[PDB]
Amino acid sequence: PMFIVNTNVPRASVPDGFLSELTQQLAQATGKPPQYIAVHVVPDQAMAFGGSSEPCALCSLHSIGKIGGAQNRSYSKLLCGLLAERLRISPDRVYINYYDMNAANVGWNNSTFA
Amino acid sequence: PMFIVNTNVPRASVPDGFLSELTQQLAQATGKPPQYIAVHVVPDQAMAFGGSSEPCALCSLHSIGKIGGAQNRSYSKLLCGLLAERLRISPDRVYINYYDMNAANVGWNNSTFA
Amino acid sequence: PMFIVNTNVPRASVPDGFLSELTQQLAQATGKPPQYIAVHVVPDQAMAFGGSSEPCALCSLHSIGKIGGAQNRSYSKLLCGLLAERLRISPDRVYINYYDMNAANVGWNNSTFA
């Protein structure tokens, strides 16, 4: 799985250790070994949510399965909880788009997962 | 809905006001209150379109419905028009990918839109 | 087609000519005309792969067709090979997400490809 966060929160306000905490909590949440989890955090962005430039986040989670109704509500509570705790962003100023990827449409290591 | 613009136009050429203008124009165009519209503009990117580094943009528009053949033509005319007028980019150097997102695959406020 | 690369490799390690090589090789692999190929490279990113901050990349390839099982394995071989040779990134620290885009869902030049 791959988790990407784009935020207007400044780089100085992203705590040390955040990439590792995202990797650990996503490995646990998805029930996958951490060797499979990629994370990416992009601060200092020019973005607005509902016309306001108060802290906000636009994020994505891609996974080959383990995506769906109840699972996504659980991911949202975990990930908004981390973004509120670590980056001080309110949960109602966060969007996370979930993508169930087909194994044939994920490349890695010169081939795909198919 | 969520609109993202990535462009090689430099940061000083993006007008103050452009994020607000996009928020209002998209609220009008999607029929959704502006409180729901998230916008994000990333200038200074290393990109090319047809091998050329003339001003160009790679964009995406995600919405829970309000996505389809004739709606997408109208969004492309609206959004290319804003990009040409404000960032001086040729409409034929712009790509906009449209995503009709399932409510259960958009997280927000600790849960999803389902 | 559009190919995006996000990486933690520093901007100074991305060689001159990389965007043009990706454009040409993408045209060679997809058979699509170079004039319509877009490429985008984002270095200096805060990202981890498998809990490690060794060089890695998260990428995406969008194309209106020319996407599927055998084609995607071929693209992964080509693109991991360019990232290893030019950015010194190990192929097993690269993810590439592939998207077969509906022509109606790709805006360009005030309209769509539908």
Numbering used by the authors:
A (entry chain A), B (entry chain C), C (entry chain B): 1 to 114
Quote the authors verbatim.
Macrophage Migration Inhibitory Factor (MIF) is a ubiquitous multifunctional protein and a key player in the inflammatory response and innate immunity. X-ray structural studies have consistently shown that MIF exists as a homotrimer. Each MIF monomer consists of 114 amino acids and is composed of two anti-parallel α-helices packed against a four-stranded β-sheet.
To understand the role of Leu46 mutations on the three-dimensional structure of MIF, we also determined the crystal structures of L46F, L46A and L46G huMIF at 1.70 Å, 1.70 Å and 1.60 Å, respectively. Similar to the wild type species, Leu46 mutants crystallized as homotrimeric proteins with dimensions of approximately 35 Å×50 Å×50 Å. In agreement with our previous structural studies, X-ray crystal structures of MIF variants demonstrate that the Leu46 mutants conserve the same three-dimensional structure pattern as the wt protein. Finally, crystallographic data and enzymatic assays do not show any drastic conformational change of the catalytic site or activity of MIF upon Leu46 mutations. Using hydroxyphenylpyruvate as a substrate, we showed that all Leu46 mutants are enzymatically active. Thus, decreasing the hydrophobicity of residue 46 (via mutations L46A and L46G) destabilizes the hydrophobic pocket and results in distant structural perturbation that is transmitted through the backbone, affecting the tertiary structure of the MIF. Taken together, our data suggest that the intersubunit interactions involving the residue Leu46 play a key role in the structural stability of MIF and provide new insights into the role of a novel intersubunit hydrophobic pocket in modulating MIF’s conformation, stability, and potentially its receptor binding and biological activity.
